Ligand SMILES: Nc1ncnc2[nH]cnc12
């Protein structure tokens with residue numbers, strides 16, 4: 001049987017909105033993931049696919065997107081248990097390494113993902129902290145849409161400490177984000193295939209300030225992210241996991 | 245109408261930290277997979293006087309076998325445990341690092357005042373405070389006046405070691421204790437409006453002279469016993485009391 005349900009896990013409202021409009025999704029009103037939660041769930045149906053987009057929502061105290069690994073892991077867990085999707089797509093913005101071939105505006109598919117900020121100097125715990133995990137292989141999607149691909153390194157900091165950099169260079173990542181590896185951890189626990197669409201908003205090895213460049217390109221880059229996400233959804237429609 | 249506390253959930257990262265407590269109250273490991281269906285999470289249930297006691301652990305990592313420590317698994321089991329078990333209060337009990345300069349000593353079991361993260365650095369307005377994620381533990385003045393436990397702020401991060409960047413932030417946030425799950429458990433407890441208390445037992449001194457991993461593991465067994473003793477006194481104190489009597 002072909003894929004019939006897809007759940008997008010997106011950290012920022014700014015990243016989700018373009019997709020919500022494109023597919024005419026509606027904000028769920030019956031708090032299916034739990035009562036009193038700030039999480040936002042948009043639902044719709046494109047062709048033969050049920051489409052849901054889940055976001056961690058606004059922090060109650062500050063009012064900004066609840067970015068990071070903890071909220072991403074929670075909404076991934078809750079949405080999987082409630083919706084039982086066939087596949088998860090973690091779509092969002094990220095930092096990229098120019099030396100690795102990444103350019104502003106590129107929307108990457110991810111080969112595998114790791115964490116660069118879970119350092120535990122104990123024999124097996126060390127490999128556990130890194131959490132190397134392969135994304136669901138989608139060779140045909142990659143070929144047909146001609147997307148770039150690379151390894152993603154996740155951490156809860158937007159900046160990059162000296163220690164972070166040493167480890168990121170070591171794991172040879174092309175992309176840097178704040179949720180990916182956590183979404184993969186949860187998808188693994190619940191045995192749900194996960195794919196990533198990461199749009200480069202800033203160059204970590206560039207010259208411009210990370211924060212400034214990120215905010216400056218957010219709008220145009222999330223539009224590009226939607227463009228690719230749309231092509232991905234149309235490609236998945238009618239297909240089975242074996243033909244991606 | 246408010247009533248006495250009837251259920252308590254202990255969120256414990258390492259099975260080794262939980263076993264002492266499980267054996268103490270003769271809790272049984274639920275084999276019918278209560279919380280989830282197909283997860284490595286371990287749930288021990290039992291009854292002590294007028295309190296239902298649940299102890300949840302992230303369990304063994306399928307790939308490496310060791311305890312699934314860290315903020316992500318802790319947040320997940322806290323979330324799932326709250327929705328399935330509907331506890332009146334959550335107790336995050338476990339080992340931690342302590343700062344000698346802040347008054348911590350090996351073996352001390354601390355009651356946490358508030359908690360923050362030291363490794364979620366987002367150096368921009370508003371997001372910076374979000375990353376720190378300051379949250380206050382549930383107020384238990386009577387418990388503290390009875391057990392006379394030391395108190396202090398807890399700083400959470402997913403690394404057992406301490407980078408130069410981590411250190412600068414921990415010293416700046418004036419934390420007395422350092423762990424790998426606290427702030428995440430508090431984040432989830434706050435989202436679902438469930439009171440949360442922390443019992444953190446010092447296994448190593450971050451500003452001491454011994455290697456962190458070495459001292460941590462060296463004192464793990466003995467300190468976890470001290471943790472059980474305090475956890476037991478806390479359980480017996482809570483019994484018969486309502487949230488306002490804590
Ligand atoms: N440089 C970066 N690091 C982490 N997350 C990011 N999101 C966008 N740019 C990023």
Ligand SMILES: Nc1ncnc2[nH]cnc12
Pocket residue numbers: 339340341342403404405422423424447448450456460
């Ligand atoms: N120094 C330390 N840092 C983080 N978690 C710990 N658990 C025990 N000792 C610790």
